[model samples]
Target: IVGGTASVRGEWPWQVTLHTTSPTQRHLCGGSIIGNQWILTAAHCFYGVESPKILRVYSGILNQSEIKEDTSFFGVQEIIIHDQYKMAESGYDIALLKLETTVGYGDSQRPICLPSKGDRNVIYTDCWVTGWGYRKLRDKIQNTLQKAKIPLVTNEECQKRYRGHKITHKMICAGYREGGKDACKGDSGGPLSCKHNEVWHLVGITSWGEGCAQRERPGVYTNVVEYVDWILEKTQAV
Candidate 1:
């Protein structure tokens, strides 16, 4: 759980810091800049929230340092959760948030690329992980963002490790045995990516895990392949 060592590609300035309350911003979830007006994240991350303003999204944030006034912070203008996601079954645990204003792309903020067909299972390559989640219990949350290195685990390997857990085709796992470097809480909904054909394809979105930094307990991600169509439709890319 160190900084600058993660396999996560792209330095999207429009990356968001989600705050559930107003007075002080608490980093609770991670989201990526998919377009000038859209961000990709998990549905459970936005569940029970009626409006976007309830959460403050800090954009143009790199390493968690941002001048609020100068930052591209936006109120949740709209929320699009997949209609078929079921928490009881852990399916489709993802969503999208539309910013009130289109994020101006420049050196500091830009968009990350999405996956294309036959790009599934990119996790076989050692991938990168980044977030602001728990790194140490006694240590305060990293005032700056944090990242790690993990490899894409095959579905068979993941299911074998999880045993009885329903490790479906919609999910993937990543981590190493000696622990100390897995996506934990607060890293939820963040991207787990791989570079393919010079284009960055999102392989997973940090979704859930059994515990933090446990051997054989890899962090589970929302498989990006199975939902490409749904994502395209939701983003209105069609």
Candidate 2:
């Protein structure tokens, strides 16, 4: 959530920070816990490089600079990027991260439910995006996690608004035409979640956008519903 405010501890348990370096770890992108040892994120975050050993996942972290003592860190064992993903376009930008070890469950650390095939048309009346990404364009990533509520706009409206780019079926669009709220750098691969039937569902994965909340340009996300089968098959592998 770009234009949104800071979030409290344990507000978003599924949130995870992707780091490339250790010790004074550098935050690369955001992700969500979909299973005990599986994380969902954007493929572009790796920049076409699938080196799991070089990556780390920080769970239950609300502040990047002041990591809580209880927060856990996990090493990446394998990274599975969507084969159709390309750097040029936003299509098929989702990826999965297999942790070296299963994360412990706690109030501040848990998994978010992925949508089922039948839940594809479940339009959320309310949705929120969370991350520790940049506050604005050209700004440094924030230390505390931030959240912003973005409206769900139809694919047709999104296509009509961003005529310059092709809005593929694999993408979901959210935000406002008037701007002021969106996902930015370091926010990629985070969740765009919405509550359904009293449970929160990971509906979208933060992908790309035009200049962080620019007028008439909404944030584009990877539609999770479209890849449920792929996710299940990959995560279910023995």
Which candidate number has the best TM-score?
2
lDDT for residue 170 in candidate 1, whole number 0-100: 87
Write down the lDDT of every candidate, Cα atoms only. Answer: 0.71, 0.87
Question: How many clashing pairs in candidate 1?
Answer: 5
lDDT of 1 at 86: 73
* True lDDT of residue 39, candidate 1: 83
The all-Cα superposition gives candidate 1 an RMSD in Å to the true structure of 2.9
Q: Cα RMSD (Å) per model?
A: 2.9, 2.0
What stretches of model 2 exceed 4 Å from their correct place? 22-24, 48-50, 68-72
lDDT by residue (tens digit), candidate 1, 126-228: 4777777767533454556666768777778878778777888888788775666787667787788666666666777888877777777777888878888
- TM per candidate comes to 0.87, 0.94
Write model 2 residue lDDT over 145-214, tens digit each, in one string. Answer: 9999999889899899777889988899998889999988888989999988899999999998777988
